[PDB]
Design a protein around this ligand. Structure first.
Ligand SMILES: CCCCCCCCCCCCCCCCCC(=O)OC[C@H](COP(=O)([O-])OCC(O)COP(=O)([O-])OC[C@@H](COC(=O)CCCCCCCCCCCCCCCCC)OC(=O)CCCCCCCCCCCCCCCCC)OC(=O)CCCCCCCCCCCCCCCCC
Ligand SMILES: NC(=O)c1ccc[n+]([C@@H]2O[C@H](COP(=O)([O-])OP(=O)(O)OC[C@H]3O[C@@H](n4cnc5c(N)ncnc54)[C@H](OP(=O)(O)O)[C@@H]3O)[C@@H](O)[C@H]2O)c1
Ligand code: SF4
Ligand code: SF4
Ligand code: SF4
Ligand SMILES: [Zn+2]
Lengths: 71, 376, 152, 57, 176, 90, 208, 114, 319, 111, 94
């Protein structure tokens, strides 16, 4: 019903996905209590937030950072 | 066409060869302006003042920011005032290039149009290096200038503005002692009486005919008292001696630029107290108190106290006034604009009677009518 | 054949060798077109001479902003243009109306009046993305009138 | 002078089209978005109209 | 203060009238005036030869849109809903959803390229530094059905270059 | 050359302020990384809000309105005239 | 108080206090409220019968010339029991001072036009007729400026919703360019930005 | 009612004024049918005018009737002259717009309570 | 399914597919479908520029263009896959110098009565004419009757339409007259015996379709369109000269688009007022338009102002 | 002089006795306004301080100072039209007390 | 005597740059006929010449060659073919 708008138009769509490209990161380890992640370099990227890494042990990708972060 | 590119339909019951009755029609570009600012905030509705003229870019937003600082009880900081003059007296070398060229293209001279716009493109370069963009720059804010101008622009304004007095020495030999253009413009459209003040005119088509007065040294704006210059007057009351203000003001604007490069104090740019200016990008990214005034200054606007106001600056063809009733919350109440074209063009019907039809196209160019500003 | 389809390597080259634009300078995108006729990015003598009369023009260029009180005066002027006519709209107000898309007195788009070929976006497009606009219009002329009378 | 006193109910017509008899208005006092606790949102009687269809483009 | 222009009488003597009657009759003006000031054609013309040469610009220029992403990809957007609240023209149209991993992202992201009035108010409202007015005026499509942008155009249009954009922002983040 | 002094017999003579800046004396770039200070009461222990108060100023003070040998005072002293600006006033 | 706060002066705050003291003293037939604006400006409330004379008193005099009409405007206000608000504005060219004339009105009650006193307000009065519907009496030429030939809403008032009723289009069904009912392709979202806590204590309304 | 009128006083100068301008419009129907080169029958243009004046007959008040006069007085400037380019006149004749149902059962198939 | 007002920018459920749609009959249909708003997939043969005046009818994404030769199968099997209705009006006048003209009304309405029928369409519609009779006339008028007969085999319920003769705005039927500023006005053939036919107005035929396109229950029930009031005379040709007061072709001229010294002089005077038991227009309501109201408009020659119209006809007899 | 500054006026002709006629031309009219108005109480005061400086002292230039009109032909026109105000001032009555107070809540701005 | 005083420079400039074939091959696209001073390196065969610092605006001229990604021989140059790195260079942005 809807798919007629790209008959002979090649339907240009995204190729790589970051739906899960998190997982190829070597999730960082520290051996501490709280760590900063202004991830992506200073004065760029998301603001600095302090995460508690004490479960048994992960952080939660800061809410912003996306990258899997842990101890 | 070839009369403002595609606007201004006017009727002329011409009396044989003379006109003796002329009554134009505006409203072909109305767009619904003043209805639509009621549904925006203060910072968000700023780029509809930039589009209210065409060619004045920093001269508008100079009379919006100054009409909101009054309501806030905030002055701009000292470096923020010597930036506004270096731009507010560089758009007076753009509104006067157009009024002395497109006037002389309707008459029929070809080259000084081309001879000046080839030179003019050295000066739309300067907007792009400072704000980011080509003509309509959202740069001035109600707390001073947005951001700092790059390393440069003082070895590049200085190379430019030391070599502009030769380019204005060409139009003197094209036009002034020319005979045919003097014959096309002497003693034409002589409205000089105190009906040329009962009509409520602003500047030139005033002071070029008699009355010496302008709002730059009878009222202040800024740190603008600290410059020295003289205000050119006209002798008789016709178009050729309100032409000669526009040639002479361009020489006097070079003096106010060369006096402005020497005086800029280093310092801040934004108003400091952060309920009006946003903070730095390297400041809203470490501390906590900076997001709450970066975030909430972008969901809702400021909070400005109630009470009306009015102001006026010297736009390079007249005034530019705002009657900005603010209720007391983030979205303003009525915002009535005063611009020329109401005075400057209601007084054409007096001005045109007795002369030919080919005198009428000679009249209109000297008022420097820019449409969308008849949207007042 | 090879005889007939060769002939549209001249007529479809003659039609793209000299366009004669009418323009409707209405609002701020008038001035940023006049800098293209200014000799920096000089519009003329790269093929395309400037402004003419409505009886003689090929390819009109809408700019500015179309209100209600200009909507019949556009369509009347579009009629007088000849058969191989083309319409280019520059400006971000002849594309769906800039802002003033929500205010009462604007024809919301200027495609609702005429059929327009090449859309050029940008509050004022920089006379740099307009030569790239018309050099898209010349690349559009790859059509033929041969293999129409010679097929059917 | 010519002040011509009388009494007749002021009702105006002509300006809208057909939405006089189709739509009933509604006057209400707004009441405190409860996720916060500031009471400046009250203190003004407003009016607001009916809601109709919203399809999908 | 003052200045008086065109306020001067003629001399009106025997000498200088012949100086003026040589002007009107034998044209000491109008040839010395503009038979010489015009030609003066002998300067070099200044024409940008456009398909090959291009003109100067500046590293804060405004143009086509983009969405950056981090080192190894994260789609830098976080759908915080500010780039849509200060578009003056109401172009942006965001509809988020809690994505399955737990971090929130967009689903639909729509920028008209016709209502876009080209402020630079999206570029500066963003906390996480994602949506950037990218420096390429390459445009001029042929259908109004096309200039509406989706999410998965902008990323493609934002990863056709990031060597272009990240050379610009590193030069210019020090002011703002 | 012969095309050089022909431009000097016509329309004055400049040869230094040419129209195109395409030749030398044109600025190339700028080197340094810019650093911008933050001055006006950004610091601590004296510089402080409730002394900084850029808003919260009172309503317009009304004068006597409804519900003495006054010398007919003007709104302001009248405008004194101007000079004639000795650069070249004629 | 500090830098970045506007310095006032008591000079103009005393002179413009003292000047317009006797504009209520010498015409107490019309002037019914005068108040001084805190930014050194004057407002003077005038009953609508005194539309011509208090201008005419100002228009020529030795002590208050006010010979330039800068701005005539008009504001509409629901909940006032008299809707509109006509605001005149003048300029003392001899004296460098401003004064505003705020005359209230209603729809059906006409206003005697200020055409003969100032010939600047010829076009400032044909306009207000189109945008609100105020009928200025005995106008020498009343017409239709800044609107189309089909609007019947007087759109700058609060009862005309932002987009119109008459969204226009073309069709080839004959040749014409014809109207239609209004048909938007987007909602025009209405945000809510009015936040609580009553941040301004000075302008505070009486409690009730 | 303490407010001065516009033109009339009470119910008699008003209801002779409205009968005055009807004789203008009745005369100035068959002029515009050739002054704009529009091809309809001339009796259509007279039917629309006698339709239009009966619309407003529910008024029990002066100076409201006088307000409608000013609108009716104004249109004879544009219509008797040539200021509307053939298109602003033809909007009174809704030729393009589809017919509305105006009966209950036909609304119920199409449309959520108009 | 529908939504909201049907003025513009609505959904209205239907997804048509209108073949042809460039000529006088096919274009004026699509105008009324670019109002109520629907995916009117219009394919065109070989005309990029000649279809440009069709685009400000579909709002934004309503219409869509495809190219197709007609004889090949899948070029017409690619657009018919997503559809609700599909109407046909393809065809022309005289035989071309490349095509064969015989099966073009037989195989080609069958080439889109192919897997198009199978794929799941409904309300397939063809056209007819009030004079197409298998008796020995004509080369065009019969061999349209082949298309009435040989294509009826497939799709046993269609509502094939049989409109009358049309007068309109940009047509060829009436415009074949008054273009005869020439060395003489020769009628056919110096006789007024059977003139005239029923000139139905083109707005009614394009209003019959759009009332049938969701009728419902109009399948197989073929229809015949009533004409004006009432028959007409030879006075028509005198009436045409009464008020008149006496695409994609080529680059310079197309040397053969003629007035056809062939059957065309008698392709219109064979009248055959057919069966009045056909339902056929008023029950496909509601439309009944005369000639003498819409006759001023399309007739247009060098007077351009002064008409002074009083010319009329009685009925004529056999009314 | 031949230029009167402001174009539209003319040097024609006599100062110092064109003025003193027009002050006392109004003073006869100024006595007629029924004296409880403050209008006479100020307007009598501004003309007497004027004419006591005017009559009768050279030069033409010295009259421009101490009576702050513009140039001398325009100083005529400040007083020329105050006459035209004065005879209108009898017609309506500003000195009478106030009429038709507005309905007690109109000039209260923050709603 | 400037007819040979400055044509001597142009004689090696016009003639001896690519012989007889290499001169008119660039003449048939525009009047861009001056051989530039320096060369670029990138990328395909399109040596983006950079002039002798004796111009501004026309001192960074590029050349296109043939069929980037499905184009014609030489008679279709649209200007958007450039790699997204020379945008930092061709526009004089750094
Ligand atoms: C043919 C076009 C092809 C061509 O010329 O080559 C391109 C070639 C491009 O090379 P280029 O590097 O761009 O030239 C830049 C020169 O600096 C620019 O060269 P130029 O503009 O300086 O021109 C040089 C020369 C050229 O002037 C002439 O044409 C000589 C007059 C014609 C005599 C035959 O002008 C003169 O100064 C000679 C004046 C002769 C004296 C006149 C009598 C006055 C004496 C008393 C005082 O241009 C030239 O060759 C320049 C010479 C043109 C001669 C014109 C041909 C005449 C036959
Ligand atoms: N009901 C009536 O009264 C009546 C009267 C006369 C004729 N007709 C016939 O009913 C239909 C009305 O069409 P019309 O009035 O609009 O005139 P028309 O000129 O025939 O338009 C019909 C379209 O069919 C196209 N066409 C011709 N041959 C084609 C082919 N092999 N393949 C694809 N398209 C072809 C034509 O040119 P393109 O290929 O360039 O598109 C034309 O655009 C036609 O079939 C016509 O022959 C009916
Ligand atoms: S929105 Fe664009 S086209 Fe419209 S006036 Fe502004 S710059 Fe010009
Ligand atoms: S770029 Fe910033 S403002 Fe825009 S959606 Fe992402 S987080 Fe929100
Ligand atoms: S440039 Fe401005 S208007 Fe355009 S999308 Fe960004 S914020 Fe919105
Ligand atoms: Zn992080």
């Amino acid at each position: 019903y809807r798919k007629v708008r790209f008959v002979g138009r090649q339907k240009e769509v995204n190729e790589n996905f970051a739906i899960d490209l998190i997982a190829e990161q070597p999730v960082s380890q520290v051996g501490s209590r709280v760590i900063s992640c202004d991830g992506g370099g200073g004065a760029l990227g998301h603001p600095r937030v302090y995460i508690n890494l004490d479960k048994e042990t992960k952080t939660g990708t800061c809410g912003y950072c996306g990258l899997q972060f842990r101890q | 066409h070839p009369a403002a590119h595609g606007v201004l339909r006017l009727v002329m019951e011409l009396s044989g060869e003379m006109v003796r009755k002329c009554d134009p029609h505006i409203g072909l570009l109305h767009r619904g302006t003043e209805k639509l600012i009621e549904y925006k905030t203060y910072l968000q509705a700023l780029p509809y003042f930039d589009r209210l003229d065409y060619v004045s870019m920093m001269c508008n937003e100079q009379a919006y920011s100054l009409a909101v600082e009054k309501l806030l009880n905030i002055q701009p900081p000292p470096r923020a005032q010597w930036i506004r003059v270096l731009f507010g007296e560089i758009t007076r070398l753009l509104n006067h290039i157009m009024a002395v060229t497109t006037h002389a293209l309707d008459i029929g001279a070809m080259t000084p149009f081309f001879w000046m716009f080839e030179e003019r493109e050295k000066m739309f370069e300067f907007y792009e290096r400072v704000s980011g963009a080509r003509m309509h720059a959202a740069y001035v804010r109600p707390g001073g200038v947005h951001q700092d101008l790059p390393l440069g622009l003082m070895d590049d304004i200085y190379e430019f503005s030391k070599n502009f007095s030769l380019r204005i020495d060409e139009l003197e030999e094209m036009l002034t002692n020319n005979r045919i253009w003097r014959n096309r413009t002497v003693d034409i459209g002589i409205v000089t009486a105190e009906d040329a003040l009962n009509y409520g005119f602003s500047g030139v088509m005033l002071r070029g005919s008699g009355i010496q007065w302008d709002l730059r040294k009878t009222q202040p704006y800024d740190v603008y008292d600290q410059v020295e210059f003289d205000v050119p007057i006209g002798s008789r009351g016709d178009c050729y001696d309100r032409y000669l203000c526009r040639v002479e003001e361009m020489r006097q604007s070079i003096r106010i630029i060369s006096q402005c490069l020497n005086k800029m104090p280093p310092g801040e740019i934004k108003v400091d107290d952060a309920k009006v200016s946003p903070p730095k990008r390297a400041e809203m990214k470490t501390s906590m108190e900076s997001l709450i005034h970066h975030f909430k200054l972008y969901t809702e606007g400021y909070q400005v106290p109630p009470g009306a106001t009015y102001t006026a600056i010297e736009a390079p063809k007249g005034e530019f006034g705002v009657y900005l009733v603010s209720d007391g919350s983030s979205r303003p109440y009525r915002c009535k604009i005063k611009a020329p074209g109401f005075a400057h063009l209601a007084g054409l019907d007096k001005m045109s009677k007795g002369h030919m039809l080919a005198d009428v196209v000679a009249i209109i160019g000297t008022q420097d009518i820019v449409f969308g500003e008849v949207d007042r | 054949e090879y005889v007939v389809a060769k002939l549209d390597d001249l007529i479809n080259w003659a039609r793209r060798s000299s366009l004669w634009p009418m323009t409707f300078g209405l609002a701020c995108c008038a001035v940023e077109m006049m800098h293209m006729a200014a000799p920096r990015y000089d519009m003329d003598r790269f093929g395309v001479v400037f402004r003419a009369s409505p009886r003689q023009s090929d390819v009109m260029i809408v700019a500015g902003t179309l209100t209600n009180k200009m909507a019949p005066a556009l369509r009347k002027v579009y009629d007088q243009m000849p058969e191989p006519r083309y319409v280019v709209s520059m400006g971000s107000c002849a594309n769906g109306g800039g802002y003033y898309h929500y205010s009462y007195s604007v024809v919301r788009g200027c495609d609702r009046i005429v059929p327009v070929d090449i859309y050029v976006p940008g509050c004022p497009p920089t006379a740099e993305a307009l030569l790239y606009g018309i050099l898209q219009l010349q690349k559009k002329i790859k059509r033929e009138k041969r293999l129409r009378i010679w097929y059917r | 002078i010519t002040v011509d006193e009388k009494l007749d109910i002021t009702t105006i017509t002509g300006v809208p089209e057909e939405h006089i008899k189709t739509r009933k208005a509604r006057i209400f006092v707004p009441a405190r978005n409860n996720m916060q606790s500031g009471v400046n949102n009250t203190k003004k009687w407003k009016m607001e109209f009916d809601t109709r269809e919203r399809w999908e483009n | 203060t003052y200045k008086y222009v065109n306020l001067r009488e003629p001399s009106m003597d025997m000498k200088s009238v012949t100086d003026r009657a040589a002007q009107t009759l034998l044209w000491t003006e109008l040839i010395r005036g503009l038979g010489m000031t015009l030609s003066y054609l002998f300067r070099e013309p200044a024409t940008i030869n456009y398909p090959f040469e291009k003109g100067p610009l500046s590293p804060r220029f405004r143009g086509e849109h983009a969405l950056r992403r981090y080192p190894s990809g994260e789609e830098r957007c976080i759908a915080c809903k500010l780039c849509e609240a200060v578009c003056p023209a109401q172009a942006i149209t965001i509809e988020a959803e809690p994505r399955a991993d737990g971090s929130r992202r967009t689903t639909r992201y729509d920028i008209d390229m016709t209502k876009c009035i080209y402020c630079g108010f999206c570029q500066e409202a963003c906390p996480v530094d994602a949506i950037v007015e990218g420096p390429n005026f390459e445009f001029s499509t042929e259908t109004h059905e096309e200039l509406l942008y989706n999410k998965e155009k902008l990323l493609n249009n934002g990863d056709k270059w990031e060597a272009e954009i990240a050379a610009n922002i590193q030069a210019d983040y020090l002011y703002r | 050359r012969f095309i050089q002094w022909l431009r000097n017999w016509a329309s004055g003579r400049d040869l230094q302020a040419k129209l195109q800046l395409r030749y030398q004396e044109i600025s190339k770039r700028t080197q340094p990384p810019p650093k911008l200070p933050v001055g006006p009461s950004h610091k601590l222990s004296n510089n402080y809000y409730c002394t900084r108060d850029g808003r919260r100023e009172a309503m317009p003070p009304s004068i006597v309105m409804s519900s003495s040998e006054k010398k007919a005072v003007s709104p302001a002293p009248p405008i004194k005239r101007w000079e004639l600006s000795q650069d070249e006033p004629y | 108080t500090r830098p970045t706060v506007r310095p006032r002066n008591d000079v103009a705050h005393k002179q413009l206090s003292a000047f317009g003291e006797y504009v209520a003293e010498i015409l107490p037939k019309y002037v019914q409220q005068v108040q001084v604006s805190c930014f050194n400006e004057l407002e003077i409330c005038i009953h609508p019968d005194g539309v011509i004379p208090v201008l005419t008193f100002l228009r020529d005099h030795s002590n208050a010339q006010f010979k330039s009409l800068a701005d005539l405007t008009a504001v509409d206000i629901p909940t006032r029991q008299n809707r509109f608000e006509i605001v005149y504005n003048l300029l003392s060219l001899r004296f460098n001072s401003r004064i505003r004339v705020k005359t209230y009105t209603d729809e059906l009650t006409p206003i005697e036009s200020s055409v003969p006193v100032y010939k600047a307000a010829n076009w400032y009065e044909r306009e207000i007729w189109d945008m609100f519907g105020v009928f200025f009496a005995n106008h020498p030429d009343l017409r239709r400026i800044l609107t189309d030939y089909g609007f019947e809403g007087h759109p700058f008032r609060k009862d005309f919703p932002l987009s119109g009723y008459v969204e226009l289009r073309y069709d080839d069904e004959v040749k014409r360019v014809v109207a239609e009912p209004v048909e938007l392709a987007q909602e025009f979202r209405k945000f809510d930005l009015n936040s609580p806590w009553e941040a301004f204590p000075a302008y505070r309304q009486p409690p009730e | 009612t303490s407010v001065k009128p516009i033109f009339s006083r009470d119910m008699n100068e008003a209801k002779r004024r409205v009968r005055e301008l009807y004789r203008a419009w009745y005369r100035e129907v068959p002029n515009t049918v050739h002054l704009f080169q529009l091809d309809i029958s001339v009796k259509q243009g007279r039917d629309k005018v006698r339709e239009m004046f009966k619309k407003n007959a529910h008024i029990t008040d002066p100076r409201v009737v006088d307000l409608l006069v000013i609108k009716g007085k104004m249109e004879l400037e544009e219509t008797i002259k040539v200021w509307k380019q053939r298109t602003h006149v033809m909007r009174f004749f809704h030729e393009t717009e589809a017919p509305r149902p105006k009966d209950f059962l036909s609304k119920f198939y199409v449309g959520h309570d108009p | 399914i529908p939504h909201g007002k049907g003025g513009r920018s609505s959904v209205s459920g239907i997804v048509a597919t209108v073949f042809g749609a460039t000529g006088f009959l096919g274009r004026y249909v699509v105008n009324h479908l670019g109002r109520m708003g629907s995916q009117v997939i219009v394919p065109h043969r070989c005309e990029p520029y000649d279809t440009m005046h069709l685009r400000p009818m579909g709002d934004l994404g309503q219409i869509i263009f495809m190219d197709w030769n007609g004889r090949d199968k899948d070029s017409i099997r690619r657009a018919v896959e997503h559809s609700s209705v599909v109407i046909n009006l393809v065809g022309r006048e005289w035989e071309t110098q490349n095509f064969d003209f015989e099966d073009v009304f037989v195989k080609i309405p069958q080439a889109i009565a192919q897997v198009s029928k199978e794929a799941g369409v409904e309300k397939f519609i063809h056209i007819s004419h009030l004079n197409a009779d298998i008796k020995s006339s004509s080369k065009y008028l019969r061999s349209k009757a082949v298309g009435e007969k040989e294509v009826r085999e497939t799709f046993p319920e269609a509502t094939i339409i049989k409109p009358a003769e049309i007068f309109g705005r940009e047509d060829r039927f009436l415009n074949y007259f008054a273009n005869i500023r020439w060395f003489g006005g020769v009628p056919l053939i110096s006789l007024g015996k059977k003139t005239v036919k029923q000139p139905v107005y083109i707005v009614d035929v394009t209003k019959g379709i759009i009332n049938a396109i969701k009728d419902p229950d109009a399948r197989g029930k073929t229809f015949a369109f009533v004409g004006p009031s009432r028959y007409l005379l030879f006075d028509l040709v005198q009436y045409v000269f009464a008020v008149a007061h006496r695409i994609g072709r080529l680059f310079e001229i197309s040397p053969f688009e003629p007035w056809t010294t062939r059957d065309k002089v008698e392709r219109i005077h064979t009248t055959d007022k057919i069966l009045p038991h056909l339902p056929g227009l008023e029950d496909l309501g509601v439309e009944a338009t005369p000639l003498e109201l819409k006759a001023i408009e399309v007739l247009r020659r060098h007077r351009t102002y002064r008409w002074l119209s009083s010319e009329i006809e009685d009925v004529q007899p056999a009314k | 002089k031949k230029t009167t500054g402001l174009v539209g006026l003319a040097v024609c002709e006599t100062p110092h006795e064109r003025l003193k006629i027009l002050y006392t031309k109004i003073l006869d009219v100024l006595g007629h306004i029924p004296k409880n108005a403050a209008y006479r109480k100020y307007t009598e005061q501004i003309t007497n301080e004027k004419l006591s400086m005017v009559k009768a002292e050279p030069d033409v230039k010295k009259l421009e100072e101490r009576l702050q009109g513009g140039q001398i032909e325009e100083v005529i026109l400040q007083a020329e039209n105050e006459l035209s105000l004065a005879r209108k001032m009898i017609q309506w009555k500003p000195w009478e007390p106030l009429v038709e107070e507005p309905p007690a809540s109109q000039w209260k701005w923050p709603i | 005597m400037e007819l040979l005083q400055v044509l001597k420079r142009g004689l090696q400039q016009v003639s001896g740059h690519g012989g007889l074939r290499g001169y008119l091959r660039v003449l048939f696209r525009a009047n861009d006929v001056r051989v530039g001073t320096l060369v670029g390196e990138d990328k395909y065969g399109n040596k983006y010449y950079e002039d002798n610092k004796q111009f501004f605006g026309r001192h960074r001229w590029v050349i296109y060659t043939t069929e980037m990604n499905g184009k014609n021989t030489f008679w279709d140059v649209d200007g958007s073919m450039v790699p997204p790195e020379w945008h930092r260079w061709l526009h004089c942005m750094t």
